[PDB]
Amino acid sequence: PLESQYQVGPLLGSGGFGSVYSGIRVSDNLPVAIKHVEKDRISDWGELPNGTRVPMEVVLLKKVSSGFSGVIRLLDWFERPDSFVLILERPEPVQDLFDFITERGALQEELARSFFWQVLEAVRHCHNCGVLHRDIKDENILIDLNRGELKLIDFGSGALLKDTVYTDFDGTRVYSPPEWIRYHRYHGRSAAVWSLGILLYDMVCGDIPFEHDEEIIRGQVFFRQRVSSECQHLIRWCLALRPSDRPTFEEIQNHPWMQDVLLPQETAEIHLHS
Numbered sequence: 001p002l003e004s005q006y007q008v009g010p011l012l013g014s015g016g017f018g019s020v021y022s023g024i025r026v027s028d029n030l031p032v033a034i035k036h037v038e039k040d041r042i043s044d045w046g047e048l049p050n051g052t053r054v055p056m057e058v059v060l061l062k063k064v065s066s067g068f069s070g071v072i073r074l075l076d077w078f079e080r081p082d083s084f085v086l087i088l089e090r091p092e093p094v095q096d097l098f099d100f101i102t103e104r105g106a107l108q109e110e111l112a113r114s115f116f117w118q119v120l121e122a123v124r125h126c127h128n129c130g131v132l133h134r135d136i137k138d139e140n141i142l143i144d145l146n147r148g149e150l151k152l153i154d155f156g157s158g159a160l161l162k163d164t165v166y167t168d169f170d171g172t173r174v175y176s177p178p179e180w181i182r183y184h185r186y187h188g189r190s191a192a193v194w195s196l197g198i199l200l201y202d203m204v205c206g207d208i209p210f211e212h213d214e215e216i217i218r219g220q221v222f223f224r225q226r227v228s229s230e231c232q233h234l235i236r237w238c239l240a241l242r243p244s245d246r247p248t249f250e251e252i253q254n255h256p257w258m259q260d261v262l263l264p265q266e267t268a269e270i271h272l273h274s
């Protein structure tokens, strides 16, 4: 039982990530996070080996929880009469990237580079395990302050990665690409590159570039902060209106702006205990 091996605590973020509470694995006092989702509110279901009917979030989580510390890992899960319970890693201390940027404003390019590199690595990992996140944004990224490591969270809007067209989407609209707004269809990788474009802009500029469908459709990027030419090119590239014109992950990590990133621990020593 859950009440048996974990000591449940208060809600986290007052409903920021939905119904997730802080907890402790009582056997070793491991900090965990405990997410509840009720069956009635589940739109997308999956099948686990051995045929157990389970929310897609769990299949995706099982596939990406391999020990790579770029994504928050699923330690365990339980089924209850009317809901499901997830036990997840809880970094300590930790801060959400959205709150980090809010408090700090536009990040210095050295720091945005380290962060953005880590996020790419995490997304590459997901794709390699057959998972498309679909909700990449600052709110879904945690910072492990001690180690300077970023971690992806919230795979609730995710899908199995496929090479064919997607026609559904339940993520954040201002992070969605022109194809979705205009046609309600997209391909996984080029849409993910678009959202990464939005994310990077948010990091260097302190906010998102588009607030309405029309701004997204137009694809004009105005920079309100001082941003290097190299970084501007990368952002404008990811935010190409035509999916085909967008870079591949390899092209992004080979971009000149991306060269000579800091190691996560270096990043923490320089920027996190500033």
Ligand SMILES: COc1cc(-c2ccc3c(-c4ccccc4)[nH]nc3n2)ccc1O
Pocket (backbone or CB within 6 Å): 012, 013, 017, 020, 032, 033, 035, 057, 061, 071, 072, 073, 074, 088, 089, 090, 091, 094, 096, 142, 152, 153, 154, 155, 156
């Ligand atoms: C990796 O997959 C998922 C992860 C989460 C999620 C959310 C908040 C989390 C915190 C935390 C700890 C302290 C403060 C704030 C957050 N720690 N670990 C978390 N995990 C929720 C759904 C998912 O599918």
